[PDB]
Design a protein around this motif. Sequence first.
Motif, short mmCIF file in Angstrom:
data_model
loop_
_atom_site.label_atom_id
_atom_site.label_comp_id
_atom_site.label_asym_id
_atom_site.label_seq_id
_atom_site.Cartn_x
_atom_site.Cartn_y
_atom_site.Cartn_z
N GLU A 107 0.81 -1.16 0.00
CA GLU A 107 0.00 0.00 0.00
C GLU A 107 0.88 1.25 0.00
OE1 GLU A 107 -2.41 1.43 3.84
OE2 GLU A 107 -3.74 0.40 2.48
N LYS A 108 0.52 2.22 -0.82
CA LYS A 108 1.32 3.43 -1.09
C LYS A 108 0.53 4.68 -0.78
CE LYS A 108 3.34 5.72 -5.28
NZ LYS A 108 3.67 5.54 -6.74
N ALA A 109 1.13 5.69 -0.17
CA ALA A 109 0.54 7.01 -0.03
C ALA A 109 1.50 8.10 -0.48
CB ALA A 109 0.13 7.27 1.40
N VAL A 110 1.04 9.01 -1.37
CA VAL A 110 1.77 10.19 -1.78
C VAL A 110 1.73 11.31 -0.75
CG1 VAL A 110 2.14 11.99 -3.51
CG2 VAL A 110 1.45 9.72 -4.16
N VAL A 111 2.87 11.58 -0.17
CA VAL A 111 3.02 12.61 0.81
C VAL A 111 3.70 13.92 0.44
CG1 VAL A 111 2.80 10.93 2.75
CG2 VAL A 111 5.13 11.51 1.95
N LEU A 112 4.49 13.95 -0.62
CA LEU A 112 4.83 15.26 -1.23
C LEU A 112 4.50 15.11 -2.71
CD1 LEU A 112 7.29 15.00 1.08
CD2 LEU A 112 8.29 16.90 -0.15
N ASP A 113 3.79 16.07 -3.26
CA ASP A 113 3.66 16.09 -4.72
C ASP A 113 4.67 16.98 -5.39
OD1 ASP A 113 2.68 18.68 -4.12
OD2 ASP A 113 0.59 18.12 -4.60
N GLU A 114 4.58 17.10 -6.71
CA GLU A 114 5.59 17.86 -7.45
C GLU A 114 5.77 19.27 -6.89
OE1 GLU A 114 5.45 17.80 -11.89
OE2 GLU A 114 6.44 19.82 -11.98
N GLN A 115 4.67 19.95 -6.56
CA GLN A 115 4.72 21.31 -6.13
C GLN A 115 5.43 21.43 -4.74
OE1 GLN A 115 0.78 23.02 -4.65
NE2 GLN A 115 1.48 24.88 -5.73
N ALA A 116 5.25 20.39 -3.88
CA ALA A 116 5.85 20.38 -2.50
C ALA A 116 7.35 20.22 -2.69
CB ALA A 116 5.22 19.31 -1.57
N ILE A 117 7.74 19.35 -3.61
CA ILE A 117 9.20 19.14 -3.88
C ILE A 117 9.88 20.42 -4.42
CG2 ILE A 117 10.79 17.90 -5.43
CD1 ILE A 117 8.94 15.42 -5.03
N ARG A 118 9.17 21.10 -5.34
CA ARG A 118 9.68 22.35 -5.91
C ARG A 118 9.85 23.40 -4.82
NH1 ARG A 118 5.70 23.15 -9.32
NH2 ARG A 118 4.60 24.73 -8.17
N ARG A 119 8.84 23.55 -3.98
CA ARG A 119 8.90 24.51 -2.90
C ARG A 119 10.02 24.20 -1.91
NH1 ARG A 119 2.45 25.56 -2.27
NH2 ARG A 119 2.30 26.93 -4.11
N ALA A 120 10.14 22.92 -1.53
CA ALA A 120 11.29 22.53 -0.62
C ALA A 120 12.72 22.84 -1.17
CB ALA A 120 11.13 21.07 -0.30
N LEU A 121 12.97 22.50 -2.41
CA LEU A 121 14.21 22.77 -3.06
C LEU A 121 14.51 24.28 -3.20
CD1 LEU A 121 14.26 19.91 -5.81
CD2 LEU A 121 15.41 19.99 -3.53
N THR A 122 13.44 25.10 -3.42
CA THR A 122 13.67 26.49 -3.51
C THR A 122 14.10 27.05 -2.13
OG1 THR A 122 12.30 26.70 -5.46
CG2 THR A 122 12.47 28.65 -4.02
N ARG A 123 13.41 26.63 -1.11
CA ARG A 123 13.78 27.04 0.27
C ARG A 123 15.22 26.56 0.63
NH1 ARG A 123 13.43 23.99 4.48
NH2 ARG A 123 11.66 22.90 3.72
N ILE A 124 15.58 25.30 0.33
CA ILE A 124 16.92 24.77 0.65
C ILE A 124 17.97 25.59 -0.06
CG2 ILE A 124 18.53 22.75 0.37
CD1 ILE A 124 16.00 21.06 0.88
N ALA A 125 17.78 25.93 -1.34
CA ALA A 125 18.72 26.78 -2.06
C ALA A 125 18.93 28.13 -1.37
CB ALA A 125 18.33 26.95 -3.52
N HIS A 126 17.86 28.71 -0.85
CA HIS A 126 17.96 29.98 -0.11
C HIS A 126 18.78 29.82 1.11
CE1 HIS A 126 13.99 31.19 -2.30
NE2 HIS A 126 15.01 31.13 -3.12
N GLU A 127 18.55 28.73 1.84
CA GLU A 127 19.32 28.48 3.08
C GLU A 127 20.76 28.27 2.76
OE1 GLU A 127 17.13 25.06 4.48
OE2 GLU A 127 15.46 26.18 5.27
N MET A 128 21.05 27.56 1.70
CA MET A 128 22.50 27.39 1.25
C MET A 128 23.19 28.72 0.94
SD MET A 128 22.30 23.93 -1.03
CE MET A 128 22.20 22.33 -0.22
N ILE A 129 22.46 29.64 0.30
CA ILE A 129 23.04 30.99 -0.02
C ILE A 129 23.29 31.75 1.32
CG2 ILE A 129 22.30 33.24 -0.94
CD1 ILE A 129 21.05 31.50 -3.28
N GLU A 130 22.38 31.61 2.28
CA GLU A 130 22.48 32.39 3.55
C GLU A 130 23.67 31.87 4.34
OE1 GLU A 130 21.47 35.08 4.53
OE2 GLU A 130 21.84 34.94 6.67
#
Lengths: 164, 165
Positions: free
Chosen positions: A1-24
């Motif tokens: 049994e499988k459940a989707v817990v991040l969709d494409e948009q959640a992954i995009r938003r997470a990666l954008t935030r991580i990139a910001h934290e890396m710059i800071e």
Amino acid sequence: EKAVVLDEQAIRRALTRIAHEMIERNKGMNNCILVGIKTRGIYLAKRLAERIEQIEGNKVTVGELDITPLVKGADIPVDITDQKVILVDDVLYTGRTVRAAMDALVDVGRPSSIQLAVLVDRGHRELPIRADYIGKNIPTSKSEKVMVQLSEVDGQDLVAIYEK
Amino acid sequence: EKAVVLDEQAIRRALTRIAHEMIERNKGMNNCILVGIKTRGIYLAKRLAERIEQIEGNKVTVGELDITEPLVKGADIPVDITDQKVILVDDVLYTGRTVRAAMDALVDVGRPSSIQLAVLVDRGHRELPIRADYIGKNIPTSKSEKVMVQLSEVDGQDLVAIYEK
């Protein structure tokens, strides 16, 4: 049994935030090397490098390690000596793949420091290893399995939990 | 220049709380091994073992790694660690590079089921993604400062100090 817990948009938003934290935290990421682990780490690292470059106008080097665990291969296209390395992992679980990566990089490359960025942390560490940047904490039972799918290899972007 | 930041009583209170967290997270610490690192880690491990024994009535095995770039000189771990829970005991966590080497030295001797890390002091400035599971006190520092632990068994009294550059 499988459940989707991040969709494409959640992954995009997470990666954008991580990139910001890396710059800071790393002075705009000049001279700092991203090293992917596991099959999907390298593709996450490339996505991060792209987001950072779109802001800083610099070049962020991406390398990779091939790990079973045993480090069986590597591709790191610049000298990492005295440089900042960030390991990029899709799912952090026991920490044992990260430990294998870390020991190889300190031993061969003598970086100044090594950080860890993960898309998902599913908990259940078996070593005192924690992520510095995290897309999503996803609580799990011991018997569950967390998987990441990415466009570049699986054909779409999602994170799923599988039950026993 | 030196400043005392934990006195004997603060150290005693920290160690008592860590022993409690160890009992809560490890089923009373039955079959779990404490492994001290550096000169004073072993003494902190023995003190923790004693506090856990005063509650549980059990025996907590204490081992040691001799580490002096960190080079592993040797080990003395008096039971087989295979499939068992090991907790490394460190006086001061700083870059994490000693802890990295200790994890390697363990695996040389055995294959534990898991390894955790208990430290008296965490002074920050890690250089590896290594964090402590049990912490006596977080002590913020500048890069150029130094943190040192004195214990009665080796130094003659118990304190934690910060030294300026």
